[PDB]
């Protein structure tokens, strides 16, 4: 138990084990028309509004509520030729991102699709 | 105390074997076997690590293979720049790197 | 061999970002000028994670909580003087005089006794009453006809006299999906990759303290004394000297003055300075003669480190400017000191008892930003003594070397506190591939 | 300038406050003066005194602004008795030229002294040059203050004389004279001349005649 | 990437005690075992030892375990993941059989059941 | 050690520069400060000026115009000139020995200080007239006398005081009383001075009176028996 960020420096197999210690410090913390309430406040509303935010395309790829979920769309080898002991047992999340930054709104792309049509299917085939 | 092959040899398009074995104190299942391209006197090369797996760019036509006496390193579809010493790594987590006898091909 | 994308939730990634900071403040409770009573409490426990094996690059000199603390002082000091009672009516024609002589030739016109007519609570009635005022708040006409220093360019407001300026410490904290990083190297420049990096929910405690030249109060360095510029090699960028051990420094005010409310009108009285009573002295502040000599012998060495070894430089007094540039000024105890720092900075080094600074005093204070706002500080009663560390210098360069101090811009303030500090945004979405699929 | 009186009992303690307060820090200087005599030093600085003072003469430090110059006399006898004065220096206020009003302490409780009237008839000398006046003499009283008649025979007398206001002695008494101016005639003519004398509520007389 | 720079090709007679610098780059020093591995003429490669430039701590091979001494100084950060770094190694009662080309690896990834396997290595060094 | 001594005309006309002199005996006179005082009848005592021991001058603002304090330090002599006398400027001048005092409040280095006199030694006083009226000598007259017995000597119509009397040139001193003088209307005091003495010395130990009025420069001496 390292802490919240505790595993930032860690490998991306070691920190994938410490996952809901980011996850419960996502939306709590501590935070009239003053200075400090004007501001106070903003910060409580960015908060809420970021935290769902990411919870959206969790819910858009078929995630809800899950900290680690395997997909259907295979892994482009153009995104990261690197391999598995390669990446879980050598890179951190913060190089990882740095790396496969470009490709992010692509796998977006996909993983919003293969939900919005397995959802389909499972609806065809739930009618027999 | 881990002998590979005494030496070998094919030509251009073919494949060779290199062979790894010892007795229960350098191999084999009990431990890990890695592969090294070492030209004499030079850089060495990494080319399979934990007996099969291939370290990052290492071509395709390498290939690794364990029974469970002894270890094996195919190079199928040779190529000029293949003429080298080949040497075997008989290790665990926590420990070293015993190396092989050697093997020119 | 098949590889899937696998989504997580939480991955411990960031990116430097901006966003609003809010405050925290400890428990103490009249109200300060800061506004700490609206801000929230802070844990008693500051939680500070270590962020192993992380290195982050800091760069103190694009940083935005400085930028964004900047703003919040001056927000805080326009919203506290915005209630407080406007002395328009006080801006007329001064007849003033000397106060009591019988001394040094040239320090009897430092304060002056004014008498002038005034509004009262009805309507057609004047008084006239007299105060005390400072030389550096009044100006004349030419006869011993005076003026207030405010009444041609600015707007003047006293200060509720309840709010006080004693600085408190301030929590700067970021919002939940946030997270300041702290740079706990204890050589850091300023600026580059820090090798030794920590997460906070909320800065230390901070003073808001507005000091000149010298820093007072602040944070000290854990091992030498360490040198900040964005480019030393530029002169024009001044010097953030930060001290490892502080040397003290002993201000005081003797003279006794006393408070007299005026009514200027219906629900509206003017605090005049009143009477002097006792000896009339001088304000001055002492540092120990010893210290400061060795303290500024720690400021060279370090300072040769990016000029010579054989290189020799020195320092000087202030260059010119406004009167707020030039002198070491801030509050003590309630009133705006300006000490003379030529006692100071006045040596030259070369290759290998106290003393006392005159301090004048001023109550018409004006803003550093826009000139067209200006307070009036109501005068405190009794005899003022505050004892502070100085913790810090500002010095300037000119292109041997000499330095001189200065610096009248509030946020060089900041920066001397919020070097270590980062805000960074949180991104727990990762995608990355596995051998596992849905289904 | 003006003078301040201020009676105090014998054996009691005189506190005699300055008449001007200091603005500021004060150095505050007393002086005794009896009228006709040169002033003595009592304190110099607030608090220090010269030798040959005693220790009944006190002056209050400048310890802390708000103390009240105050020279104060303990056991008073009747050789206190005198004008004292406040040289009165301070931060605020200029060069005390003056020496300020003057506090003019009389002792009560002394004893009642009776008169020693001593009459002396003209000199021949004097009777020579056409000029005859006697010398009444009163000495040695207390309190200083004494009503002189002068009787030709048994009729009055008061064209002529002229009395002297009374002035203490060294001996903390006090002494006057008065003297009747008349032609060597009326010396003779006369039967005798008397010199009465009343000093609180008694009358003395002492008389003399032409023989 | 990665580079790991040697010392010179100087030679001594034996008794002596020499020290051969290995200098890192293009990656961070600390994440990573040092490895150091001789090729004499007269003998097959024989793994001499690694370190840990994070924990300091040290292992090698019992044929040089009161004879060696190996070391590393502290990094120098120069981006968010390259450092530049420094390893030294010495051997004692020393002769001339010991004479060969000496070279310095980096481990091969920081967690998993190869970690420090020599994986990028140096230019090598001749011996007496 | 240090005392001093007035020395003065005792009368001077109205309109005319009034010269008094002081000379210290004991110590030196360029070495301190010295002060003029003079106390007029009712008006309290008045501080005319004071020169420093490097002999620098400060007078009285009260009279500023019209004084000029000298010294000769060949001697122990000290000066005083007043000029334009009036009637009002009739007093006892003292000269006194003034001690510089040094208060300090604040910082010396500021100047938050000031300096105060005060004067520890004092003369005995040097009386002075002004009165257009012409000086006259007295005419000193026996009393004769007639357990104990007393004798006299009337000194008759002087001007002005004061008059120095001694009974046998300084040696008769016990018993003698010189009683305040007497302003008679004509214009010129009259003084009496007596002596207690035991009626047994009557023969014939010879009792003379010793009158001086320097004013006008008639020493007169007399005796006196039955
Ligand atoms: C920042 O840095 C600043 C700079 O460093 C610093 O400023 C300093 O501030 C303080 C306070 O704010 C200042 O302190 C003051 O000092 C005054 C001077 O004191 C010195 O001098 C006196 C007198 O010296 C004469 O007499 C002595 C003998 O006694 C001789 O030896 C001297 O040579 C000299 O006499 C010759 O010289 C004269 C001038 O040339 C001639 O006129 C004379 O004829 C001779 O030729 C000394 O007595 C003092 O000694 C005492 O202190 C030393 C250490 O210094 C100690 O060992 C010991 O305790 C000694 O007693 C000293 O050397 C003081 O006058 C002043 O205190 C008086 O004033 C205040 C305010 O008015 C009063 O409240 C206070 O109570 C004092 O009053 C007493 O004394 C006066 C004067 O006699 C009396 O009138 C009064 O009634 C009272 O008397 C009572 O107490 C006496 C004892 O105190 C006692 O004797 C009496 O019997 C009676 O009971 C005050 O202390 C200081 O000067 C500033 N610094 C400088 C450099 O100026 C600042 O604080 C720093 N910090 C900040 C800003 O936070
Ligand atoms: C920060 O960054 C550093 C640098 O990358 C990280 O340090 C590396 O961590 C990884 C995993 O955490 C390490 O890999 C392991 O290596 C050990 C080999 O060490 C063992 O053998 C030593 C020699 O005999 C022995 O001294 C050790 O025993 C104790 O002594 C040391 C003294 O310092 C002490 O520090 C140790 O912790 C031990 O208590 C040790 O036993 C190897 O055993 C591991 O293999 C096991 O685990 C893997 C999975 O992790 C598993 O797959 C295997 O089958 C086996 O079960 C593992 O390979 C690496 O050695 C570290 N050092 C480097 C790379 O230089 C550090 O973890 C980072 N921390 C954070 C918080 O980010
Ligand atoms: C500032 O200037 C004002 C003048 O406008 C000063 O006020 C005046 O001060 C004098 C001197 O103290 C006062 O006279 C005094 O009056 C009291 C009470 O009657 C009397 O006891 C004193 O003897 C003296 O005569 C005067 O009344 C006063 N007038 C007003 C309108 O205040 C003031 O003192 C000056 N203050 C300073 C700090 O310089
Ligand atoms: C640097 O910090 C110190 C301490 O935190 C500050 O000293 C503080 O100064 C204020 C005002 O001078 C003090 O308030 C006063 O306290 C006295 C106590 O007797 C009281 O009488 C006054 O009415 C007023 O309340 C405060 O106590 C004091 N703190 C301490 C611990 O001494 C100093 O002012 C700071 N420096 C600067 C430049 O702000
Ligand atoms: C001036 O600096 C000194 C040294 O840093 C401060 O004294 C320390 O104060 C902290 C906070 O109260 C304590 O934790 C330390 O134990 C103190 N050490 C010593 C030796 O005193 C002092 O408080 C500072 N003063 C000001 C006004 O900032
Ligand atoms: C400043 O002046 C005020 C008055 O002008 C002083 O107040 C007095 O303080 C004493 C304390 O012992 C009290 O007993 C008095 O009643 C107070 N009087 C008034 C009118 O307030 C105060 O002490 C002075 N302060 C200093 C440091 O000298
Ligand atoms: C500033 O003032 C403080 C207190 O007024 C001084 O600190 C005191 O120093 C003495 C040394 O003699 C100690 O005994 C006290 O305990 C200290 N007081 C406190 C509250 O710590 C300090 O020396 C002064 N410094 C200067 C430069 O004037
Ligand atoms: C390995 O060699 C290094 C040489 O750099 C030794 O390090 C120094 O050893 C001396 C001798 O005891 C110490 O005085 C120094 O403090 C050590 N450090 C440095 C930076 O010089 C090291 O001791 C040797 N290995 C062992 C196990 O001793
Ligand atoms: O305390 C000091 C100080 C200390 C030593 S000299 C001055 N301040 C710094 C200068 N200053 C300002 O510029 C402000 C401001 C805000 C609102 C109205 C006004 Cl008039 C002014 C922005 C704060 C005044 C307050
Ligand atoms: C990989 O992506 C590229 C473009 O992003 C696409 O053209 C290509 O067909 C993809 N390959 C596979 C195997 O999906
Ligand atoms: C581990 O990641 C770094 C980051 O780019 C890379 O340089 C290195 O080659 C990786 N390790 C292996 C064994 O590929
Ligand atoms: C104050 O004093 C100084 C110096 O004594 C003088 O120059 C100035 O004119 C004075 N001012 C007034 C208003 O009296
Ligand atoms: C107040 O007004 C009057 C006009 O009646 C003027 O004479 C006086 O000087 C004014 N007061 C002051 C202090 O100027
Ligand atoms: C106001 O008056 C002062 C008096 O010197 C002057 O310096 C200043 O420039 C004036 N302000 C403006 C805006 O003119
Ligand atoms: C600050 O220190 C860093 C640390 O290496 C250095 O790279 C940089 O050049 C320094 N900058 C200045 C202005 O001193
Ligand atoms: C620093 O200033 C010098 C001249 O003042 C300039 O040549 C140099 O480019 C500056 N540094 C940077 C990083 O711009
Ligand atoms: C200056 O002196 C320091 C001593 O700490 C030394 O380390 C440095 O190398 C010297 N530099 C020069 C240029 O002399
Ligand atoms: C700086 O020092 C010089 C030399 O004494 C002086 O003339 C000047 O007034 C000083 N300036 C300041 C702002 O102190
Ligand atoms: C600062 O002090 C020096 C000497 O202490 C003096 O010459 C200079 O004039 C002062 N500066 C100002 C602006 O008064
Ligand atoms: C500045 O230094 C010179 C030389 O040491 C000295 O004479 C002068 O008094 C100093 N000025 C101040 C204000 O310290």
């Known amino acids: 138990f390292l802490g919240f960020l505790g595993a930032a420096g860690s490998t991306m197999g070691a920190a994938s084990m410490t996952l809901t210690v980011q996850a419960r410090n996502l939306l709590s913390g501590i935070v009239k028309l003053t200075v400090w309430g004007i501001k106070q406040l903003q910060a409580r509303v960015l908060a809420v509004e970021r935290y769902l935010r990411d919870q959206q395309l969790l819910g858009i790829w078929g995630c809800s509520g899950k900290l680690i979920c395997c997909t259907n769309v295979p892994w482009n080898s153009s995104w990261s030729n690197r391999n598995l002991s390669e990446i879980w047992d050598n890179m951190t999340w913060l190089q990882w991102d740095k790396e496969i930054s470009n490709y992010t709104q692509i796998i977006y792309g996909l993983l919003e699709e293969s939900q919005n049509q397995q959802e389909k299917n499972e609806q065809d085939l739930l009618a027999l | 105390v881990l002998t590979q092959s005494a030496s070998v040899s094919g030509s251009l398009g073919q494949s060779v074997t290199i062979s790894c074995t010892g007795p229960n104190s350098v191999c084999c299942s009990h431990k890990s076997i890695s592969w090294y391209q070492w030209p004499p006197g030079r850089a060495p090369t990494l080319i399979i690590y934990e007996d099969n797996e291939r370290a990052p760019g290492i071509s395709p036509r390498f290939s690794g293979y364990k029974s469970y006496w002894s270890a094996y390193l195919t190079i199928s579809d040779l190529r000029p720049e293949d003429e080298t010493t080949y040497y075997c790594c008989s290790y665990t987590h926590n420990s070293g790197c015993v190396f092989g006898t050697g093997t020119k091909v | 061999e098949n590889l899937w994308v696998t989504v997580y939730y939480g991955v411990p990634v960031w990116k430097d970002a901006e966003t609003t900071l809010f405050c925290a403040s400890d428990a103490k409770a009249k109200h300060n000028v800061w506004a700490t009573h609206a801000c929230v409490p802070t844990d008693p426990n500051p939680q500070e994670i270590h962020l192993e094996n992380v290195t982050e690059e800091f760069n103190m000199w694009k940083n935005n909580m400085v930028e964004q603390m900047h703003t919040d002082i001056i927000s805080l000091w326009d919203q506290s003087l915005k209630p407080c009672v406007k002395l328009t009516p006080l801006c007329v024609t001064l007849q003033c005089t000397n106060v009591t002589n019988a001394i040094t030739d040239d320090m009897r016109g430092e304060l002056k006794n004014c008498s002038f007519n005034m509004t009262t609570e009805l309507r057609d009635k004047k008084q006239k009453v007299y105060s005390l005022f400072y030389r550096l708040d009044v100006v004349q006409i030419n006869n011993k006809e005076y003026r207030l220093i405010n009444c041609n360019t600015s707007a003047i407001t006293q200060a509720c006299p309840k709010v006080s300026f004693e600085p408190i410490p301030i929590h700067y904290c970021a919002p939940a999906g946030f997270a300041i990083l702290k740079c706990k190297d204890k050589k850091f420049n300023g600026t580059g990759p820090c090798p030794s990096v920590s997460t906070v929910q909320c800065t230390h405690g901070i003073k808001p303290v507005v000091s000149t030249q010298l820093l007072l109060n602040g944070s000290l360095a854990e091992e030498e004394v360490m040198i900040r510029s964005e480019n030393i090699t530029n002169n024009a960028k001044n010097i953030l000297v930060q001290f490892n051990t502080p040397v003290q420094i002993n201000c005081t005010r003797p003279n006794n003055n006393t408070r007299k409310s005026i009514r200027i009108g219906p629900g509206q009285a003017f605090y005049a300075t009143g009477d002097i009573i006792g000896d009339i002295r001088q304000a001055h502040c002492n540092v120990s003669k010893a210290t400061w000599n060795e303290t500024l012998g720690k400021v060279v060495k370090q300072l040769r480190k990016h000029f010579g070894n054989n290189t020799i430089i020195r320092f000087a007094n202030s260059s010119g400017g406004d009167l707020e540039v030039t002198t070491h000024s801030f509050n003590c105890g309630g009133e705006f000191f300006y000490c003379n720092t030529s006692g100071l900075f006045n040596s030259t080094w070369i290759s290998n008892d106290s003393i006392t600074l005159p301090c004048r005093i001023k109550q018409i204070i004006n803003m550093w930003q826009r000139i067209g706002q200006a307070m009036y500080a109501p005068p405190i009663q009794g005899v003022i003594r505050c004892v502070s560390n100085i913790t810090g210098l500002i010095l300037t360069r000119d292109g041997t070397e000499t330095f001189r101090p200065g610096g009248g811009d509030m946020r060089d303030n900041w920066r001397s506190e919020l070097y270590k500090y980062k805000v960074v945004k949180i991104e727990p979405l990762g995608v990355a591939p596995t051998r596992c699929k849905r289904r | 300038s003006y003078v301040r009186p201020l009676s105090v009992a014998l054996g009691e303690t005189a506190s005699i406050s300055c008449g001007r307060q200091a603005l500021g820090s004060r150095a505050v200087q007393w002086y005794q003066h009896r009228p006709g005599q040169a002033p003595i030093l009592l304190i110099y600085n607030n608090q220090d005194r010269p030798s040959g003072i005693p220790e009944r003469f006190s002056g209050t430090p400048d310890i802390n602004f708000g103390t009240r110059a105050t020279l104060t006399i303990s056991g008073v006898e009747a050789g206190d008795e005198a004008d004292y004065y406040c040289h009165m220096w301070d931060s605020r206020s200029g060069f005390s030229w003056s020496f300020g009003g003057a506090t003019r302490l009389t002792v009560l409780g002394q004893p009642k002294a009776a008169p020693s009237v001593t009459l002396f008839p003209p000199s021949s000398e004097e009777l020579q040059a056409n000029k005859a006046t006697l010398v009444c003499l009163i000495s040695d009283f207390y309190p200083g203050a004494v009503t002189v008649a002068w009787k030709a025979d048994s009729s009055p007398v008061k064209a002529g004389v002229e009395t002297t206001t009374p002035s203490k002695q060294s001996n903390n008494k006090y002494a006057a004279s008065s003297y009747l101016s008349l032609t060597p005639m009326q010396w003779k003519m006369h039967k005798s001349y008397s010199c009465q004398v009343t000093h609180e509520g008694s009358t003395v007389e002492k008389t003399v005649a032409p023989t | 990437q990665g580079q790991l720079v040697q010392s010179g090709a100087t030679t001594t007679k034996p008794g002596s005690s020499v020290k051969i610098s290995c200098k890192t780059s293009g990656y961070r020093f600390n994440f990573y075992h040092i490895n150091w591995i001789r090729q004499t003429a007269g003998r097959g490669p024989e793994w001499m030892g690694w370190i840990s430039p994070y924990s300091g701590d040290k292992n090698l091979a019992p044929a040089f375990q009161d004879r060696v001494n190996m070391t590393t100084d502290t990094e120098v950060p120069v981006t968010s993941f390259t450092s530049t770094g420094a390893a030294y190694m010495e051997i004692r009662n020393l002769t001339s059989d010991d004479t060969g080309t000496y070279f310095c690896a980096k481990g091969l990834l920081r967690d998993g059941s190869s970690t420090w396997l020599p994986y990028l290595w140096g230019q090598g060094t001749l011996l007496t | 050690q240090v005392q001093l001594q007035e020395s003065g005309p005792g009368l001077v006309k109205p309109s005319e520069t009034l010269s008094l002199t002081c000379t210290v005996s004991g110590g030196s006179i360029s070495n301190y400060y010295w002060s003029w005082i003079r106390q007029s009848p009712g008006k309290g005592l008045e501080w005319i000026g004071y020169?420093?021991?490097?002999?620098?001058?400060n007078y009285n603002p009260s009279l500023k115009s019209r004084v000029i304090i000298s010294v000769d330090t060949s001697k122990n002599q000290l000066s005083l000139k007043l000029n334009s006398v009036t009637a009002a400027d009739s007093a006892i001048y003292y000269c006194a020995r003034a001690q510089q005092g040094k208060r300090i409040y604040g910082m010396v280095s500021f100047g938050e200080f000031f300096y105060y006199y005060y004067m520890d030694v004092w003369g005995k006083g040097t009386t002075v007239t002004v009165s257009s009226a012409s000086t006259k000598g007295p005419s000193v007259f026996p009393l004769a006398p007639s357990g104990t017995a007393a004798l006299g000597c009337l000194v008759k119509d002087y001007f002005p005081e004061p008059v120095t009397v001694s009974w046998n040139s300084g040696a008769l001193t016990s018993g003698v009383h010189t009683f305040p003088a007497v302003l008679q209307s004509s214009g010129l005091y009259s003084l009496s001075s007596v002596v207690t003495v035991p009626s047994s010395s009557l023969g014939t130990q010879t009792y003379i009176c010793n009158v001086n009025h320097k004013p006008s420069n008639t020493k007169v001496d007399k005796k006196v028996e039955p």
């Open positions: 020169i420093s021991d490097s002999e620098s001058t």
